[PDB]
């Protein structure tokens, strides 16, 4: 039943992210729920594309499922599936990014070739801004018009955030997120990247990222006081928890070729608040 | 002197390139000298970036040292430069190819973004098709502008060639030459390349590209007749001897994630005389 099936995605949130899980545990009950299951959307998906052994095939067929979801046609045991099928009803959940987010994991099923600034926020856009859109009709019911370009820019700063402290496993795995042009513009070479050397180009060129993100993470941190009441130490808190990895990276030199523990998270949670 | 410096250059065509060595060995003394001078360039530039440590830097110095050249002011006693240098004195060798192959190197400082077809064909025009354009004047003496297409179109055939057996060296790497928009085409992901696995999706993918590998190495044969003599059979031999790697590919299924023996090479430079 519903409850059972939005407590399948209570756990799938506090496994996979306790960073989320944590933030979004003080929503109200039914917005709370329609988060897990939002939640566990994204992270069917991306977890598809980064840990399937076929991942194109396993994706088609997801897809193929939020086709039949959308027409009212999909019949399904599936957790994920019934208890966002529940929040969908519930709740003017968008279409749109739901579709956006499989877009943006096609992506991530071919090897990259970010070339500008501009290739890398259409790449974020569209496998971490639309999580920030598909949330919102729950995060600020009503308020969704004036808090949109905040959560999109959330969107660039959390995983420009994650970018930046994953060089070095995307790399083993073959993914390289950094644009080719700052590489030329810095002169930091392919061979200093397989090399994992951290040197005066690499600094300027993880620098210039990071100084946007912390420009996105200021935006979106300023649109706080328009949502309600119970969302603005969660998404805060969410926001800062991601954040904290920019200023560790900096203290460890930039060592980013292999963050926050709990306590940590709840520490910035209360400061938050 | 003259002798010992383009005597330096038979040294790295016979250690780098027993293919380009054992085929223009047959050229007349001047212009056999020559190819080794403008091999050399063409080596040095490629290990520079493939084998430096600091690629970057030493490419700029290289550049600069061209740059002298061109401008009669290199004051060097590097045997290359100094062979080069009565190659240009001597035949109408065209500084435009030699440019070109050093923007073609620059390329490959930085991670591969190779999306089309037409952006494969760029890379092979910069890093391929130059060296045939250096080596015209000498190999074609008057003869230029008649065999100048098959010479680009040999230059795509060769270095799709390498680009076909050097998959999984590249991979190694973190380079990527493989269109993105053929992967997709074909539904090669990036996990079964990272995986280094042959299915039906590869094989599809491969096959494209050999078969236009082997379209611009007819075209590249059916100029020979337009070379002087003493040019048809090197120039044939060297694009036999690099053909081949396709068969025998296929022949291996396509295990091109790890090709021609000396007896090899004068077997089928006696089979194209
Ligand atoms: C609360 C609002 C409006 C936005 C916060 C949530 C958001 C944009 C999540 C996307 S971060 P992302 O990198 O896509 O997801 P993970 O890699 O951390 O699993
Ligand atoms: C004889 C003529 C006109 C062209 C033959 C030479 C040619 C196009 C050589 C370039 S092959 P390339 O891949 O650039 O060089 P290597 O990787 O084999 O060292």
Known sequence: DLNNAYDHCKNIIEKHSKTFSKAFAMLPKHQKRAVWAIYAFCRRADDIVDEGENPKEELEAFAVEFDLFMEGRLETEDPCWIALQDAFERFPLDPAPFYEMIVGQRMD???????????????????????????????????????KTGAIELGYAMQITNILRDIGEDLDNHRIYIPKQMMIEYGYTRTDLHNKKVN?????????????????????????????????????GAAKMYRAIIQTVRNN??????????????????EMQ
């Not at 070339?115 to 969704?144: F, R, W």
């Not at 993100?213 to 706080?224: F, G, Q």
């Open 200 to 236: 005066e180009a690499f600094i300027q060129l993880w620098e210039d990222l990071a100084q946007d993100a912390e420009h996105y993470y200021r935006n979106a941190l300023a649109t706080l006081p328009e949502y309600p009441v119970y969302s603005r130490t969660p998404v805060g």
């Open 109 to 147: 099923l071919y090897p990259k070739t970010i070339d500008t600034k501009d290739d890398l926020l259409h790449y974020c856009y569209h496998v971490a801004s639309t999580v920030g859109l598909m949330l919102l009709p729950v995060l600020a019911p009503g308020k969704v018009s004036r808090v």
């Open 253 to 270: 030199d930039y060592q980013v070729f292999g963050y926050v523990s709990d306590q940590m998270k709840k520490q910035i949670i209360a």
